[PDB]
Design a protein around this motif. Structure first.
Motif, PDB file in Angstrom:
ATOM      1  N   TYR A 289       6.952  -3.981   2.136  1.00  0.00           N
ATOM      2  CA  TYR A 289       6.113  -4.743   1.215  1.00  0.00           C
ATOM      3  C   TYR A 289       5.222  -5.648   2.052  1.00  0.00           C
ATOM      4  O   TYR A 289       5.700  -6.628   2.627  1.00  0.00           O
ATOM      5  CB  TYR A 289       6.944  -5.570   0.237  1.00  0.00           C
ATOM      6  CG  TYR A 289       8.161  -4.873  -0.314  1.00  0.00           C
ATOM      7  CD1 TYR A 289       8.048  -3.896  -1.286  1.00  0.00           C
ATOM      8  CD2 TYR A 289       9.426  -5.209   0.130  1.00  0.00           C
ATOM      9  CE1 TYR A 289       9.161  -3.268  -1.787  1.00  0.00           C
ATOM     10  CE2 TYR A 289      10.536  -4.591  -0.363  1.00  0.00           C
ATOM     11  CZ  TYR A 289      10.402  -3.624  -1.321  1.00  0.00           C
ATOM     12  OH  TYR A 289      11.527  -3.012  -1.805  1.00  0.00           O
ATOM     13  N   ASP A 290       3.926  -5.335   2.104  1.00  0.00           N
ATOM     14  CA  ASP A 290       3.064  -5.987   3.080  1.00  0.00           C
ATOM     15  C   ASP A 290       2.814  -7.456   2.779  1.00  0.00           C
ATOM     16  O   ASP A 290       2.449  -8.196   3.695  1.00  0.00           O
ATOM     17  CB  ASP A 290       1.730  -5.263   3.198  1.00  0.00           C
ATOM     18  CG  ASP A 290       1.168  -5.324   4.604  1.00  0.00           C
ATOM     19  OD1 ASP A 290       0.849  -6.436   5.072  1.00  0.00           O
ATOM     20  OD2 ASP A 290       1.050  -4.263   5.249  1.00  0.00           O
ATOM     21  N   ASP A 291       2.985  -7.901   1.536  1.00  0.00           N
ATOM     22  CA  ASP A 291       2.955  -9.335   1.255  1.00  0.00           C
ATOM     23  C   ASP A 291       3.600  -9.605  -0.091  1.00  0.00           C
ATOM     24  O   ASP A 291       3.091  -9.162  -1.122  1.00  0.00           O
ATOM     25  CB  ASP A 291       1.534  -9.879   1.284  1.00  0.00           C
ATOM     26  CG  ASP A 291       1.306 -10.840   2.434  1.00  0.00           C
ATOM     27  OD1 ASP A 291       2.148 -10.888   3.350  1.00  0.00           O
ATOM     28  OD2 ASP A 291       0.285 -11.555   2.420  1.00  0.00           O
ATOM     29  N   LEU A 292       4.714 -10.332  -0.077  1.00  0.00           N
ATOM     30  CA  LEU A 292       5.312 -10.828  -1.307  1.00  0.00           C
ATOM     31  C   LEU A 292       4.663 -12.122  -1.776  1.00  0.00           C
ATOM     32  O   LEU A 292       4.745 -12.451  -2.965  1.00  0.00           O
ATOM     33  CB  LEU A 292       6.814 -11.036  -1.108  1.00  0.00           C
ATOM     34  CG  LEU A 292       7.670  -9.774  -1.011  1.00  0.00           C
ATOM     35  CD1 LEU A 292       9.128 -10.116  -1.151  1.00  0.00           C
ATOM     36  CD2 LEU A 292       7.264  -8.765  -2.060  1.00  0.00           C
TER      37      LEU A 292
ATOM     38  N   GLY B 196      -2.561  -6.841  -2.241  1.00  0.00           N
ATOM     39  CA  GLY B 196      -3.533  -7.887  -2.004  1.00  0.00           C
ATOM     40  C   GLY B 196      -4.285  -7.796  -0.699  1.00  0.00           C
ATOM     41  O   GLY B 196      -4.938  -8.768  -0.313  1.00  0.00           O
ATOM     42  N   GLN B 197      -4.216  -6.667  -0.002  1.00  0.00           N
ATOM     43  CA  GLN B 197      -4.912  -6.501   1.262  1.00  0.00           C
ATOM     44  C   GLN B 197      -6.353  -6.070   1.013  1.00  0.00           C
ATOM     45  O   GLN B 197      -6.807  -5.952  -0.126  1.00  0.00           O
ATOM     46  CB  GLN B 197      -4.183  -5.487   2.139  1.00  0.00           C
ATOM     47  CG  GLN B 197      -2.706  -5.765   2.314  1.00  0.00           C
ATOM     48  CD  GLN B 197      -2.442  -7.008   3.129  1.00  0.00           C
ATOM     49  OE1 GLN B 197      -2.500  -6.979   4.356  1.00  0.00           O
ATOM     50  NE2 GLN B 197      -2.151  -8.111   2.453  1.00  0.00           N
ATOM     51  N   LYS B 198      -7.088  -5.834   2.094  1.00  0.00           N
ATOM     52  CA  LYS B 198      -8.441  -5.311   1.998  1.00  0.00           C
ATOM     53  C   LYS B 198      -8.423  -3.795   2.115  1.00  0.00           C
ATOM     54  O   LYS B 198      -7.737  -3.228   2.974  1.00  0.00           O
ATOM     55  CB  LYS B 198      -9.340  -5.910   3.078  1.00  0.00           C
ATOM     56  CG  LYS B 198      -9.095  -7.375   3.346  1.00  0.00           C
ATOM     57  CD  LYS B 198     -10.347  -8.045   3.867  1.00  0.00           C
ATOM     58  CE  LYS B 198     -10.708  -7.543   5.244  1.00  0.00           C
ATOM     59  NZ  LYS B 198     -11.705  -8.428   5.900  1.00  0.00           N
TER      60      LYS B 198
ATOM     61  N   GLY C 243      -0.063 -10.864  13.314  1.00  0.00           N
ATOM     62  CA  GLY C 243       0.061  -9.430  13.469  1.00  0.00           C
ATOM     63  C   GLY C 243       1.401  -8.844  13.081  1.00  0.00           C
ATOM     64  O   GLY C 243       2.135  -8.356  13.941  1.00  0.00           O
ATOM     65  N   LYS C 244       1.734  -8.885  11.791  1.00  0.00           N
ATOM     66  CA  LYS C 244       2.934  -8.228  11.296  1.00  0.00           C
ATOM     67  C   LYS C 244       2.665  -6.811  10.812  1.00  0.00           C
ATOM     68  O   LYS C 244       3.589  -5.984  10.791  1.00  0.00           O
ATOM     69  CB  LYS C 244       3.559  -9.049  10.167  1.00  0.00           C
ATOM     70  CG  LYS C 244       3.319 -10.545  10.275  1.00  0.00           C
ATOM     71  CD  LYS C 244       3.917 -11.285   9.099  1.00  0.00           C
ATOM     72  CE  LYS C 244       2.891 -11.545   8.027  1.00  0.00           C
ATOM     73  NZ  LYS C 244       1.990 -12.662   8.384  1.00  0.00           N
ATOM     74  N   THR C 245       1.421  -6.509  10.439  1.00  0.00           N
ATOM     75  CA  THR C 245       1.065  -5.136  10.109  1.00  0.00           C
ATOM     76  C   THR C 245       1.258  -4.222  11.310  1.00  0.00           C
ATOM     77  O   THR C 245       1.650  -3.062  11.158  1.00  0.00           O
ATOM     78  CB  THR C 245      -0.377  -5.070   9.614  1.00  0.00           C
ATOM     79  OG1 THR C 245      -0.559  -6.007   8.548  1.00  0.00           O
ATOM     80  CG2 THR C 245      -0.704  -3.679   9.114  1.00  0.00           C
ATOM     81  N   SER C 246       0.991  -4.729  12.515  1.00  0.00           N
ATOM     82  CA  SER C 246       1.212  -3.935  13.718  1.00  0.00           C
ATOM     83  C   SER C 246       2.688  -3.616  13.905  1.00  0.00           C
ATOM     84  O   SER C 246       3.047  -2.493  14.278  1.00  0.00           O
ATOM     85  CB  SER C 246       0.665  -4.674  14.934  1.00  0.00           C
ATOM     86  OG  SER C 246      -0.626  -5.187  14.667  1.00  0.00           O
TER      87      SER C 246
ATOM     88  N   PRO D   6      10.428  -7.038   3.645  1.00  0.00           N
ATOM     89  CA  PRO D   6       9.418  -7.889   3.008  1.00  0.00           C
ATOM     90  C   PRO D   6       8.655  -8.733   4.017  1.00  0.00           C
ATOM     91  O   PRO D   6       9.159  -9.068   5.089  1.00  0.00           O
ATOM     92  CB  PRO D   6      10.242  -8.768   2.063  1.00  0.00           C
ATOM     93  CG  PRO D   6      11.622  -8.711   2.591  1.00  0.00           C
ATOM     94  CD  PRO D   6      11.788  -7.367   3.193  1.00  0.00           C
ATOM     95  N   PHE D   7       7.417  -9.074   3.660  1.00  0.00           N
ATOM     96  CA  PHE D   7       6.563  -9.948   4.456  1.00  0.00           C
ATOM     97  C   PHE D   7       6.267 -11.217   3.672  1.00  0.00           C
ATOM     98  O   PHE D   7       6.051 -11.169   2.460  1.00  0.00           O
ATOM     99  CB  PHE D   7       5.228  -9.289   4.819  1.00  0.00           C
ATOM    100  CG  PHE D   7       5.322  -8.217   5.865  1.00  0.00           C
ATOM    101  CD1 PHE D   7       6.537  -7.771   6.330  1.00  0.00           C
ATOM    102  CD2 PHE D   7       4.175  -7.649   6.377  1.00  0.00           C
ATOM    103  CE1 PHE D   7       6.604  -6.784   7.284  1.00  0.00           C
ATOM    104  CE2 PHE D   7       4.241  -6.661   7.326  1.00  0.00           C
ATOM    105  CZ  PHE D   7       5.455  -6.230   7.780  1.00  0.00           C
ATOM    106  N   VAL D   8       6.248 -12.350   4.368  1.00  0.00           N
ATOM    107  CA  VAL D   8       5.866 -13.631   3.785  1.00  0.00           C
ATOM    108  C   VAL D   8       4.963 -14.344   4.780  1.00  0.00           C
ATOM    109  O   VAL D   8       5.201 -14.296   5.990  1.00  0.00           O
ATOM    110  CB  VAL D   8       7.099 -14.487   3.429  1.00  0.00           C
ATOM    111  CG1 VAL D   8       6.708 -15.927   3.190  1.00  0.00           C
ATOM    112  CG2 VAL D   8       7.792 -13.933   2.204  1.00  0.00           C
TER     113      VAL D   8
HETATM  114 MG    MG Z   1       0.075  -8.855   6.045  1.00  0.00          MG
END
Ligand code: MG
Ligand code: ADP
Ligand code: MG
Lengths: 361, 464, 548, 79, 78
Positions: free
Chosen positions: C316-319, C255-257, C230-233, C373-375
């Motif tokens: 950046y929701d996913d690098l 790359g999300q839904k 839960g990093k989007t939260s 950034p997110f990883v």
């Molecule tokens: Mg994410």
């Protein structure tokens, strides 16, 4: 536009010009002074992964040494954070090491062609002083791994068949062509301290393995030691120096260092059986070995001047003789009754005694 | 005019040469239909799918069947559209292959029906639903501990001998009976024997009148097994878009989809990615799974069976497929050996819909309390096989709770006799809350076996 | 040298036109091969080399182009010229074309279909084009023309509250976006003598981050953890908390839904966070070329505000999905792969992007740009390739456990990016957390002296219960520091651990009622209020508290 | 006291949500009107294009040939 | 406390539903009005579009030509 200018590319000094002799440089770090002392005219390397403490160690060494040198220094930063260079410039300007320092910057955001040929510019700037004024020059390189990484990025588009792990076919030749110009000839000397990055915490990668062969003293930082809070995270068994000889540092120093390394290795051998069975299935000598080894491993840590803004402690400086004396006393069982936690993040052993006293013991 | 001719044949890969400025678009379908002119020839009936434009009026395609007997220079017909399959009410109760031709020997679909292309872009951003809803299956354990979401993805970690083809039939039956939906089953890389068995099972239990079936066999070229799921997807999209129903889609193994894609990529001469997979693994997975959404009209809900290579959960294929899933459901043997049906693991099964802002506050609390009680009972097994004060009461409640999760299904009636039930979520939550409070602590434990609501267990105890 | 005309032109006119074009182009002689195409009844359309001069029929279509007095009486029609090429290869999302003589590296080209592309490699008689869109409408033999511009995106304040794709085309269906400026996607970073040290705090609203891992305006902090942590939260709560602070937020989803993007936008709109937010999206079904330009489009949109003196925050929701898209794109171009099949410049791809976040100096205006950034890891492996690539670029990290892991989460710049009130109370809290963390390791089953039995366990348990929080409920810094001060000073030691959450809620209610002077003193001074007054207020609350 | 305050807060939040919904509906109506005007303009433009094409076809091309030659010469000079 | 909170929530939900229904009714009225205006403007601006088409053709290149163009446009529409 009328100032004298020098070309970036030139051949290395020949066999009939170098000078070979070993003198010892004092840094004020216990784990470095004891088990891997630095040479006064050689090549020093600090290997490390990501986020283990290469930059802090570099800044501490700069602070301790560059003022005492009293000569000339050059700092070249290849492929590092720009904010780090911005911080270092202002720190040097405040301390006053500027007016005897020249800096060259090619950093993370630059194309590979720029990151390839920045170390050569600082090298030329230092070579002028060495070979024209007969001075003693210090040379710092922020990360020498980025040079080979940029070369690897370029070689693919140059149209060359890749080597192992995708590297370039000419890794060793380029590394040698760079590293053979940093020597001490009959006129002057160049003391070079370099920080080397280890990709994915793998010490058997082609680039660290190739660069290991050009160094007189090395310092390996491990993530496991940093995770326990030990700082700096130098591995006491994989760090080596060519000046650790009985006739160079002395006879007491050599025996103390060898005994410390032996006890640390013996403690390292017993980790699995302690992990599975426990401490209750050991002989008395083994329990004594563990008892002294934990104390030694905690006493190898220190508090730095540049780390004050993180923790709060002012920072410490220890000469060689005090380090040898303290480890000699530890090995003799003089301080076997104090808690094992009193040994962390102190300068000398009298500070260990004071910290134990303030702990209620 | 618009005729191509064969140039090269290398197993399942063909090259066709066309006229200038008359090439077919990528993903189109080409047809070869040849009749033996002399005794040195054979008859050919083949379909090809365009993959690459190589230049010099040449197109490289993959074959959907066997290419034995092809001669360089034979005419090729360009249809002008991708593979088009028939859609509507005419596909309910029949079995098809990747090309949309029936394989159940009951006749042919008339030539005047309506057909839809296999390849299509996903629904747009402005056409999706802004809220999150819950699909009421009617199965107590699934509805309470691992709720389903309309337009969501569920991973079934079952196996052979745990009762998977019964749970699938029960889902089809319950959805069709209560919500009015329709079901599609797609079998990718399916053994022929098991497909025959499943077809006869569905015909026996009677659900065949509400479901469509598509089979891509294990003995088909890698191109055929790569595009079977798209045929079921486009068969379900008709009922989602044109009518506005809530549709179910079953995928028999989503791992064989990626394996077929990797084989096709290797055949086309591409540089392999990590662990030897195709470079476009994530793009292909996303293009499949982004069409399973809940729009403003209806929804498609997908249940997919997943096989984990080498028991490695960090492998690229399971790691890529796990980033689309919304829930999981694990079937385990020992729960079947105790006579508990369905044999769903109540602690291994998870869901992201078990949050207080989706199911409310009573449902959430009851579910967590049941989970904690079952965990404690699992812990106490070593001691049990008079230990403490509250542990006896814990075990007393946990036996009843574990037995009440079983249920009688409408598809097991033909073998047992009992009518089978459909339990709403409010009723099951209330029953579990009452069992937790202990209002029914004075009944034998066997009464809590294969019943519907909480009144049936009381009636069973009274009659026993 | 071929002309299309309504009627067969006179030979003398053909000779005159040929001589004129020979003189203009630079050839001694020129011959025209006129055609008899009757569709172009307006006039003559010339094609020489790879250049086209239009006729008059296109003007009618140009009339539609001038949909926009009365169109200035159909405005005026001019002979528009263009440089063109033809496609010779297309497949898997990469094309290859002839022509396009005077094209630049990185330019934007337009296909006859309507899709756009990048000019990547200029070879001797070839151009390599990367298609930014659906490639199933492009066939060999098609026509592609230049635009004359390096890649760029539209920027401005008209983008605030909208959902767009990496090229600036709206996807929410609310109509066109009316901007009037552009910025190149690839741009240099601020220099060494353009920055300054970070000295301002960025308040997330989460106690664990705001007290243990502080973040400053102009920093680069990494959030790393497994899937389903839960990093989007965390990102949504941080974006929501900036309602009062003068900050502009940008959210990039890679790359999300698209369904989860829809629900996230709905959550943002509920809390009134769309007055200062821009959303850039590229879902999982889009081409790899589009999945790889999204962070650059986001940073280009942010730098417009940054270089005016404003403060921006970019997520950046996913690098780790940008990296996979780039690996896929580069493997289709047949480039030798390295470790884990990643290319050689996978470090450059991320280092060139995260070096555009800076705290500008006062000569440049004083703006800032924070990055998050997110990883995503596999089984919590923090020593993989991409995680270590990005750990060596940023100024810290926050490791989420499958709950912040304080043994691996650190912040370098933070510490000087904290207010004095929280800096006074954070140290004790850190020591208590460490004390419990190491004590529980061995004291799970073992008797201890009363010191380690209570002071080392109950205090840690109370602080662990205090550090918890709920979704979409950020907390002001004054309330945060007051509750942390009470816990570190010694209250709650006689409160059951099952009642600390209700204690905190009722304490906030009491504060909002009768603690106006305390709150105003904190908000105005950024320092702790008088200790005697604080203790008196806490004693009054404890007296009125109904312990259960 | 606190319960009534929470009730008032819930009422205020619901009122704010309703006002946001009303503003969204008004903006949707305005967007529909703008789209309708744009579509009417597009239909008018298409009809204008068709009628202008028919009129230009009906127009005499005898002088249009000389006009096209002159315009081509002018464009040659300009480019 | 719980009863008062439930009553407040129910009243708030009722108010929200009423506001949404009123917005839907206003939307229906606006849609009907916009459709009627669209048809009337279609006729009027179609006459205007024919006139402006004659003007645009003349600009690219009097009354009799305009009448002929209007007849041609009517025939095309039919
Ligand atoms: Mg994410
Ligand atoms: N000598 C040290 N004493 C205390 N902490 C240190 C020391 N060296 C590194 N650290 C820790 O490491 C972090 C900085 O790591 P850094 O040296 O920037 O990594 P890199 O190896 O990439 O240069 C700091 O947050 C600090 O907490
Ligand atoms: Mg470094």
């Amino acid at each position: 536009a009328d100032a004298r200018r020098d070309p970036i590319h030139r051949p290395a000094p020949k066999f009939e010009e170098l000078a070979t002799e070993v003198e010892i440089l004092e840094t004020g770090i216990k784990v470095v002074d004891l088990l891997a002392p630095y040479i006064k005219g050689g090549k020093i390397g600090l290997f490390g992964g990501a986020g283990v403490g290469k930059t802090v160690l570099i800044q501490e060494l700069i602070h301790n040494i560059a003022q005492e040198h009293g000569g000339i220094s050059v700092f070249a930063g290849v492929g590092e954070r720009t904010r780090e260079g911005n911080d270092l410039y202002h720190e040097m300007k405040d301390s006053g090491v500027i007016s005897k320092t020249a800096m060259v910057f090619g950093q993370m955001n630059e194309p590979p062609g720029a990151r390839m040929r920045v170390a050569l510019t600082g090298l030329t700037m230092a070579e002028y002083f060495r070979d024209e004024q007969g001075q003693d020059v210090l040379l710092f390189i922020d990360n020498i791994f980025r040079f080979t990484q940029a070369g690897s990025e370029v070689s693919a588009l140059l149209g060359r068949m890749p080597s192992a792990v995708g590297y370039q076919p000419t890794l060793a030749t380029e590394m040698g062509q760079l590293q053979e110009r940093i020597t001490s000839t009959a006129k002057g000397s160049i003391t070079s301290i370099q920080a080397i990055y280890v990709p994915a915490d793998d010490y058997t990668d082609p680039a660290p393995a190739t660069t290991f062969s050009h160094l007189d003293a090395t310092t390996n930082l491990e993530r496991k030691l940093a995770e326990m809070g030990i700082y700096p995270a130098v591995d006491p068994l994989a760090s080596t120096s060519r000046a650790l000889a009985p006739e160079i540092v002395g006879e007491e120093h050599y025996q103390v260092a060898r005994k410390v390394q032996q006890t640390l290795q013996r403690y390292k051998e017993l980790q699995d059986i302690i992990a599975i069975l426990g401490m209750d299935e050991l002989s008395d000598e083994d329990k004594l070995v563990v008892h002294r080894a934990r104390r030694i491993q905690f006493f190898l840590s220190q508090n730095f001047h540049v780390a004050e803004q993180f923790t709060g402690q002012p920072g410490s400086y220890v000469p060689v003789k005090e380090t040898v004396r303290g480890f000699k006393e530890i090995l003799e069982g003089k301080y076997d009754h104090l808690p094992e936690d009193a040994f962390r993040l102190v300068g000398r052993i009298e500070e260990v005694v004071e910290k134990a006293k303030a702990m209620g013991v | 005019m618009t005729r191509g001719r064969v140039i090269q044949v290398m197993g399942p890969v063909v090259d066709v040469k066309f006229e200038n400025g008359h090439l077919p678009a990528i993903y189109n379908a080409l047809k070869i239909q040849h009749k033996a002119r002399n005794e040195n020839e054979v008859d050919i009936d083949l379909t090809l799918e365009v993959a690459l434009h190589l230049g010099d009026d040449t197109v490289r395609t993959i074959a959907m069947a066997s290419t034995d007997g092809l001669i360089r220079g034979m005419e090729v017909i360009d249809t002008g559209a991708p593979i088009s399959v028939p859609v509507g009410e005419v596909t309910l109760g029949r079995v098809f292959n990747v090309l949309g031709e029936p394989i159940d020997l009951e006749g042919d679909i008339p030539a005047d029906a309506r057909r839809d292309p296999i390849h299509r872009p996903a629904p747009k951003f402005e056409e999706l639903a802004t809220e999150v809803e819950i699909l009421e299956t009617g199965i107590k354990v699934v509805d309470l501990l691992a709720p389903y979401i309309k337009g969501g993805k569920i991973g079934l970690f079952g196996g052979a001998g745990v009762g998977k083809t019964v749970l699938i039939q029960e889902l089809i039956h319950n959805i069709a009976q209560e919500h009015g939906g329709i079901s599609v089953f797609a079998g990718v890389g399916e053994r022929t024997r098991e497909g025959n068995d499943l077809y006869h099972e569905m015909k026996d239990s009677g659900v065949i009148s509400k479901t469509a079936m598509v089979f891509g066999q294990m003995n088909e070229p890698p191109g055929a097994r790569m595009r079977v799921a798209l045929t079921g997807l486009t068969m379900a999209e008709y009922f989602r878009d044109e009518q506005g129903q809530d549709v179910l889609l079953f995928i028999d193994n989503i791992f064989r989809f990626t394996q077929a894609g990797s084989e096709v990529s290797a055949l086309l001469g591409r540089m392999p990615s990590a662990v030897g997979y195709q470079p476009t693994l994530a793009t292909e997975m996303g293009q499949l799974q982004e069409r399973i959404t809940s729009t403003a009209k209806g929804s498609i809900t997908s249940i997919q069976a997943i096989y984990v290579p080498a028991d490695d959960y960090t492998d690229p294929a399971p790691a890529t497929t796990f980033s689309h899933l919304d829930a999981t459901t694990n079937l385990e043997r020992k729960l079947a050996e105790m006579g508990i049906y369905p044999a769903v693991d109540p602690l291994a099964s998870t869901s992201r819909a078990l949050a207080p802002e989706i199911v409310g506050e009573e449902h959430y609390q009851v579910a967590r309390k049941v989970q904690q009680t079952l965990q404690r009972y699992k812990e106490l097994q070593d001691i049990i096989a008079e230990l403490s004060d509250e542990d006896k009461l814990v075990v007393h409640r946990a036996r009843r709770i574990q037995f009440f999760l079983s249920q009688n299904f409408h598809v097991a009636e033909q073998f047992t006799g009992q009518p089978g039930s459909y339990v709403p979520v409010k009723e099951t939550v209330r029953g579990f809350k009452e069992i937790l409070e202990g209002k029914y602590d004075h009944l034998p434990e066997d009464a809590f076996r294969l019943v519907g609501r909480i009144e049936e267990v009381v009636e069973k105890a009274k009659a026993m | 040298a071929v002309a299309y005309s309504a009627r067969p032109l006179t030979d003398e006119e053909l000779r005159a036109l040929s001589d004129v074009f020979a003189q203009k182009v630079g050839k001694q002689t020129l011959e025209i091969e006129n055609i008899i195409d009757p569709e172009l009844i307006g006039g003559v359309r010339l094609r020489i080399g790879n250049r086209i001069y239009d006729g008059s029929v296109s003007g009618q279509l140009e009339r539609i182009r001038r949909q926009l007095k009365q169109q200035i009486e159909n405005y005026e029609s001019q002979i528009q010229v263009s440089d063109v090429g033809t496609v010779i290869q297309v497949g898997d999302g990469i094309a290859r074309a002839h022509g396009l003589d005077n094209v630049m590296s990185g330019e934007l080209v337009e296909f006859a279909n309507g899709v756009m592309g990048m000019a990547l490699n200029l070879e001797e008689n070839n151009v390599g084009i990367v298609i930014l869109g659906p490639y199933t409408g492009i066939k060999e033999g098609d026509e592609v023309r230049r635009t004359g511009r390096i890649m760029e995106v539209p920027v401005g304040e008209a983008l605030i509250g909208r959902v767009v794709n990496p090229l600036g085309q709206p996807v929410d269906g609310l109509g066109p976006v009316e901007t009037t400026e552009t910025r190149p996607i690839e741009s240099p970073a601020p220099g060494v003598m353009d920055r300054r040290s970070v000295h301002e705090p960025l308040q997330t609203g989460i106690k664990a981050i705001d007290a243990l891992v502080p973040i400053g305006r102009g920093q680069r902090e990494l959030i790393i953890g497994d899937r389903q942590t839960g990093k989007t939260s965390v990102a949504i709560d941080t974006i929501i908390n900036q309602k009062d602070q003068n900050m502009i937020s940008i959210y990039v989803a890679i790359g999300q839904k698209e369904s989860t993007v829809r629900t996230v936008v709905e959550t943002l709109r509920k809390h009134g966070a769309l007055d200062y937010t821009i959303v850039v999206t590229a879902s999982a079904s889009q081409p790899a070329p589009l999945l790889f330009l999204a962070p650059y489009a986001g940073v280009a949109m942010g730098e417009y505000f940054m270089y005016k003196g404003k403060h921006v925050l970019v997520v950046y929701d996913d690098l780790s999905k940008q990296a996979a898209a780039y690996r896929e794109l580069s493997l289709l171009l047949r480039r030798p792969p390295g470790r884990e099949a990643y290319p050689g410049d996978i470090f450059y791809l991320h280092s060139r992007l995260l070096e555009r976040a800076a705290k500008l100096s006062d000569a440049k205006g004083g703006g800032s740009l924070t990055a998050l950034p997110f990883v995503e890891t596999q089984a919590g492996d923090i020593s993989a390739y991409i995680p270590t690539n990005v750990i060596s670029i940023t100024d810290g990290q926050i490791f989420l456990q499958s709950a912040i892991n304080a043994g691996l989460s650190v912040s370098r710049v933070g510490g000087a990016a904290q207010i004095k009130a929280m800096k006074k109370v954070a140290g004790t809290l850190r020591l208590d957390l460490a004390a419990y963390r190491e004590l529980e390791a061995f004291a799970q089953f073992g008797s201890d002296l009363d010191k380690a039995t209570q002071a080392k366990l109950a205090r840690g348990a109370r602080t662990v219960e205090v550090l918890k929080q709920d979704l979409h409920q950020p907390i002001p810094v004054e309330k945060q520091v007051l509750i942390i001060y009470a816990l570190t000073r010694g209250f709650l030691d006689d409160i059951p651990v099952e009642d600390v959450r209700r204690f905190e809620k009722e304490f906030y209610l009491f504060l909002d009622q009768n603690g106006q002077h305390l709150l105003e003193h904190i908000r105005t001074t950024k320092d702790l209020p008088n200790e005697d007054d604080l203790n008196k207020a806490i004693e009054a609350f404890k007296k009125t508290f109904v312990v259960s | 006291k606190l319960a009534e305050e929470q009730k008032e807060q819930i009422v205020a939040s619901a009122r704010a949500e309703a006002e946001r919904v009303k503003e969204t509906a008004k903006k949707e109506i305005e967007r529909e009107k703008e789209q309708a005007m744009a579509a009417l303009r597009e239909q008018v433009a298409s009809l204008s294009v068709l009628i202008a094409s028919k009129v230009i076809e009906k127009e005499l091309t005898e002088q249009d040939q000389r006009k096209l030659i002159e315009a081509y010469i002018k464009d040659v000079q300009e480019v």
